[PDB]
Amino acid sequence: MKRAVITGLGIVSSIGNNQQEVLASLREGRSGITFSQELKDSGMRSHVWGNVKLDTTGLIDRKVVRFMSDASIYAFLSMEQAIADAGLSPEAYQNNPRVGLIAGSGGGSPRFQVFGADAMRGPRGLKAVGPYVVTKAMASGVSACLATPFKIHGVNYSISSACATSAHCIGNAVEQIQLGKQDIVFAGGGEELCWEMACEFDAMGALSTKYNDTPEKASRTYDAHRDGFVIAGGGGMVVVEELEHALARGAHIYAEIVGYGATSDGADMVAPSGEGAVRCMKMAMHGVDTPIDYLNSEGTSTPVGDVKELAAIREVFGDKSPAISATKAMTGHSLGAAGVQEAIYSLLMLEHGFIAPSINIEELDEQAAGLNIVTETTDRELTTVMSNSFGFGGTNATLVMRKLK
Amino acid sequence: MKRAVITGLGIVSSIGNNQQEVLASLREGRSGITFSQELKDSGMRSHVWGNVKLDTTGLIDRKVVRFMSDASIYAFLSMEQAIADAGLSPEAYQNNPRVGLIAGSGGGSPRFQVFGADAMRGPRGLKAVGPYVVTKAMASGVSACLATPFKIHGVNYSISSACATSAHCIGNAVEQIQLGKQDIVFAGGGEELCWEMACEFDAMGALSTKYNDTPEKASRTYDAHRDGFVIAGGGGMVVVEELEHALARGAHIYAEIVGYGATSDGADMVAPSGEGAVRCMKMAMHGVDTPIDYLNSEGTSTPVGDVKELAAIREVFGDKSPAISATKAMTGHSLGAAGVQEAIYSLLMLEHGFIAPSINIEELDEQAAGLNIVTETTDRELTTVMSNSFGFGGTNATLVMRKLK
Ligand SMILES: [N+]
Ligand SMILES: [N+]
DSSP, X not given: OOOEEEXXXXXXXXXXXXXXXXXXXXXXXXXXXXXXXXXXXXXXXXXXXXXXXXXXXXXXXXXXXTTOOHHHHHHHHHHHHHHHHHTOOHHHHTTOTTEEEEXXXXXXXXXXXXXXXXXXXXXXXXXXXXXXXXXXXXXXHHHHHHHTTTTOOSOEEEEEOGGGHHHHHHHHHHHHHHTTXXXXXXXXXXXXXXXXXXXXXXXXXXXXXXXXXXXXXHOXXXXXXXXXXXXXXEEEEEEEEEHHHHHHHTXXXXXXXXXXXXXXXXXXXXXXXXXHHHHHHHHHHTTOOSOOOEEEOOOOSOHHHHHHHHHHHHHHTTTSOOEEEOTHHHHOBOTTSHHHHHHHHHHHHHHTTEEOOOOOOSSBOGGGTTOOBOOSOEEOOOSEEEEEEEETTTEEEEEEEEOOO | OOOEEEEEEEEEBTTBSSHHHHHHXXXXXXXXEEEOHHHHHHTOSOOEEEOOOOOOTTSSOHHHHTTOOHHHHHHHHHHHHHHHHTTXXXXXXXXXXXXXXXEEOSSSOHHHHHHHHHHHTSTTTHHHHOTTHHHXXXXXXXXXXXXXXXXXXXXXXEEEBTBTHHHHHHHHHXXXXXXXXXXXXXXXXXXXXXXXXXXXXXXXXXXXOSOSSSHHHHOOTTBXXXXXBOBBOEEEEEEEEEHHHHHHTTOOOOEEEEEEEEEEOOSOSSSOOSHHHHHHHHHHTTTOOSOOOEEEOOOOOOHHHHHHHHHHHHHHHTTOOOEEEOTHHXXXXXXXXXXXXXHHHHHHHHHHTEEOOOOOOSSBOGGGTTSOBOOSOEEOOOOEEEEEEEETTTXXXXXXXXXXX
């Protein structure tokens, strides 16, 4: 029913402005978290975040970047990398009805929305707002701002599902390939980092605040002393392609997506049920004859969420649990981008034969009884990896990637 | 392959709070547009809007509504209606893995993003923000605030695509059914109506500003003196159900979704290319052996967009021009909620045998010289109908619905 593989990837995150710098952080277990004067100044309780250490000035043409917000900028630079890394040229993916793009952001653009309102409420009104805000503020800014400049002609929309946003874009891209509708679909997303949005999460008490003095130690998934997640920003993009088409062009193939799970909890608004995650991982694992060697969990670094996922994993596997690591302990939570960025970390691990360490665990949580929680970079021969993404609204996404035959 | 049908629908729009109210408005060409003091006081040049005439206070459990924004409220009340109209009992759709939800909004909640920022900058800081701003402001709010209370266990996420949003949610739900992954998928969308989001359209010059004195005359698609669209809010939801599942339970079936097109322009950020729309409609018409009796056009009432759509239609049908009307002339533009609301108008026209009028056409633009644009309510036995939805970012969606035997 048509198979789907990844033929290229691109990424911009708190731990790397490309897959090279990223692979390096993953191996040394480098933290992307830094104290942020912006957050502390806004009056927040959280003073840390996984910021992108990149000066994007001049990296994008003036007539293009003028419609974009940081989530569009981070996803656009990621799409440039994935295109090159996929070995694709304009002639092959542009003005091609069979090449699409499905990417989005978890929160559109709080920053430009507040800028519009603030500017509008000033003496210059509409003239201060300017004619470029709609595209920066709209929820589909990440897919709109890339499909136009990259001249995409197939599918063009953004899936939004909070923290599982970019995992669903990929899953949806696969279904496009499976349905025989598209030969290639660029899938992923981005997310800006600003107080405007982070203050909403702190007001909800979901961001760690007891470690503003040891930033690199704030995100500490599965540690009995975790107190919430560290907000992060960035972008990511993967080239999802139909198998025959990619073998035909002699493309590099990182892996085949043999599993995609999308489920709903129908329970709580801001906390996972666990019952949903269980069914979600199982749906993804359905059909996959190879065991899951590694699992990049959601591991948000929150008291409730972490404990829930652990029980869920123990329910799906039990004793025969795969290696597990919460890359968020070092990268933070890029919210909408977390899905694609974590699918990439999973691919790099599968590609280079290793397992990133779950860092900052000065004391494991009782809820992680018989689970293989890797806490040190371990060289292993991976064949089948799994990534879990959970978001508010009890929305769940699970992806299973396996090395080709 | 599996077939998808519509078995229930629900709606809250500027022209009606339920299908009956709306049917009557369409039948009689009644405008849902009014003068807005809120837009005039904000400093905007456009002072007209398609507002929902309904105080929603108390129609939703306080426990639930505390997490919602106006886009979620409109879509949630639409769903209650759809569930009832489809004759679905709670045990029939609740906690059911084969029942999902796909519904989004175009901008989430500009109002609440700004609230968080205005609050955070005040003397109360975080204490004034509150722990409910997140689910209100996020892009997936519409799907999260509905999936949870209705105990949805299947698919759960939003699709954002500016003005094509809910149309893509519908197409996606069909895809879920064609892939055999779900039996029912509530598809739809919601949009809030506020100056925060509106001024942004006005600073772009996309809103009508010359008819503030004569509100119901502002929205005039295909009229030589049109000058932009009238912003509007509201919500809509339809029940997409697998054909065998619907017939088995003796469900009332409005029509089958026989065609679905999703395409990209890869040209201009805010103006339609026309070329992408031509492909979008031909894609949706693939395999459909019956002619299109009525076309509910995008018809935003804009100088450029109205022209481009008429050109696309000309190319698609040639001399076999079907009946055409732009319901937006009387409803305004509900952005993210437009796709599901206009499919519903179309369904009601197909269900009751009539063609709503394209009002306000005092002087037919030259571009439409050779077309069958209906300006007076005309009774007629329709069988197959199409509805176009185009949005910024060059995103395109087309739905073709057909009566069943
Ligand atoms: N993950
Ligand atoms: N339409």
